[PDB]
Design a protein around this ligand. Sequence first.
Ligand SMILES: [Mg+2]
Ligand SMILES: [Mg+2]
Ligand SMILES: [Mg+2]
Ligand SMILES: [Mg+2]
Ligand SMILES: [Mg+2]
Ligand SMILES: [Mg+2]
Ligand SMILES: [Mg+2]
Ligand SMILES: [Zn+2]
Lengths: 48, 152, 43, 108
Amino acid sequence: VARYPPIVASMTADSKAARLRRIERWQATVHAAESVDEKLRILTKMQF
Amino acid sequence: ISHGRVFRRMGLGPESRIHLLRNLLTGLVRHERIEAPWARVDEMRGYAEKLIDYGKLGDTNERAMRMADFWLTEKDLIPKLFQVLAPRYKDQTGGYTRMLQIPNRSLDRAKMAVIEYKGNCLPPLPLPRRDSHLTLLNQLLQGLRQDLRQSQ
Amino acid sequence: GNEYQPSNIKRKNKHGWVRRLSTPAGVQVILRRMLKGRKSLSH
Amino acid sequence: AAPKNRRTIEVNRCRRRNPQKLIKVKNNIDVCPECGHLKQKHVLCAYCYEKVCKETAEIRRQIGKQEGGPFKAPTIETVVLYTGETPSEQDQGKRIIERDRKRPSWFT
RNA sequence: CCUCCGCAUAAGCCUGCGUCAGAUCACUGACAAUUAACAGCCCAAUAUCUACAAUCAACCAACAAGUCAUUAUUACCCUCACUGUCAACCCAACAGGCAUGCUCAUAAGGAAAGGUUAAAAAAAGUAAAAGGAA
RNA sequence: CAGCUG
RNA sequence: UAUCUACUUUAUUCCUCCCUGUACGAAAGGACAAGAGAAAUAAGG
Ligand SMILES: [Mg+2]
Ligand SMILES: [Mg+2]
Ligand SMILES: [Mg+2]
Ligand SMILES: [Mg+2]
Ligand SMILES: [Mg+2]
Ligand SMILES: [Mg+2]
Ligand SMILES: [Mg+2]
Ligand SMILES: [Zn+2]
C-alpha cells in the first residue's frame, strides 16, 4: 500500500549513474521506434 | 528594512535556495551528520525537523510520501525516513537534530556548523558540558538548595 | 583589431624570399636587413 | 572626482592606526579539558573534532564497503563494533560495521 | 541546475591541464608521444575532338544562357615512397569574430553562488490599487 | 479615433 | 572608481454653517471674534 518511488538514478544529474540512465532513454526510443528506417535513423545519427 | 523576514535569501533565487537546502537535507538523511556553512545549516535545520514530522505521519500517508519524494533527491532514503528515522524519534516530539559550531573553514574563513541527527551510530561529538556539580560554586548553591528545602 | 587574418600562402607570396628577390627594390630590402644584421631577412 | 592633493603619512597613520582598524584582543579562548589544546568557547575543539571526524571517516568507508554501489541505504539501524566485542542483545536486528582498532576511550 | 551548444574537417597555432618531479583566490626541469587505407604530393608526346544547362528532370517552364566528355598514331612494364596526423588551440579584447558537414536537444559539452548580511544609491526582471499619455 | 501600458 | 571642505532627524489654507442675516448703517447693504463642520496641503506617526 506504500507507494515508494523507484530507486533509480536521476535523468538530469551530472553523475555516472545518471548518464547510464540517459543511455537507457535513448535506447528506449529505439525499442519504441516502429519501422526499421526509424530504428536505423536513431542508431546512426550521432556521428562520432 | 527586513522586519520579520524569517528566511535567509540564498543561492541565486528562491528556487535555488530550496534546492541548496534540499541537497543539504538529503546529505543529512544519508550520512546523519554534516559539516556545512552555518547559515545554510540552521536554515536547513528548520526544514530537517519538519521532515521528520512528515515521517511520523506514516508510510501509507499520501501527503507525507509526496513531501519525502520532493525533499529526498536520492530515492533509497525514503525507506530510511519511514523505517529508521521516524521510528527512532517516535517518543520525543521535537529536537531531532543538534547543531554546533566547527572552527572556521580553512579555505575562505566561513562560519561552519555541524548538524547531526540525535542518536546515530557515528562517534559522538565533543559536546559542550556544563560545569561539574562538585565545583565550589555548585556546592555552595547545592547547600543553599538544601537550606531552602529545610524551610518545609 | 583583428586586421591580421592569417594564411601562409599570402604571407610567403607577399613577403617571402622569392618575391623579395623578384624586383631590384626587394633585393635592396634583403641587403638592408643583411647589413643591419638581422636574423630573419624574410618570411 | 580625483584627489586634489596627496595625503600625507601623518594623515594616513592617523587613519590606518586608529583603534577602529586595529585587531581586537579576543578573550573567548580557553583550554579544552580533554586534549589541552586551547579552544574557543561557543565553538567545538578543533583537535577533538578532528579525532571524531577521522573516526567517522573510517566508519563511513566501511559503510561504503558493506553497502556496495549507490542507492543502498538500509532500512535497519546500524551499530559500530570494534575488535573483540560481541554484538549485544540490544544490537540484534542492526547491521554491524566491524572495525580493526580498539574501542576508543571517548566512543561509547 | 544550464546547454544558442557539441563532435569533426578547414584555416590558424606549433607541444600549450600526458607521466615523473619542483617552485609558485588556493610555470620550470626530465621523459614519452601523432604509425595510412583519410588527406596532400600527379599525369609522355603530337595532332584532332568537345551545338543540345542545372533544377527528384518526366514532360512543363524559362532566362540572367550555364560547374564537368575524347579520338588517332607513337612511346610505355617498374610498382605502394615522401609529407600532414598531439592539445584544453585561432584573430582579437584586455567585448566580440570565425568557413563547412553532421546532431537540432543532445548519447555530447558544462556551472550563474569565496563566506555572510539583507542599509542607501545604481542596473536588470517581475507584481501593482484607481487612472489610462495627464 | 478606439485600445493598452509605472 | 569622491581626496579635501560643507552637510547627513532645528501647522497653514479654502469652503460651509453659526454667532446673525445681529453689530454698524438710515435704506441698499451687512460684521466680527470665538465656535462647530467638511476638505486640501505640509509636518509627524
Ligand atoms: Mg580514399
Ligand atoms: Mg585528431
Ligand atoms: Mg555531459
Ligand atoms: Mg549571494
Ligand atoms: Mg560574493
Ligand atoms: Mg534607470
Ligand atoms: Mg493596474
Ligand atoms: Zn579538545
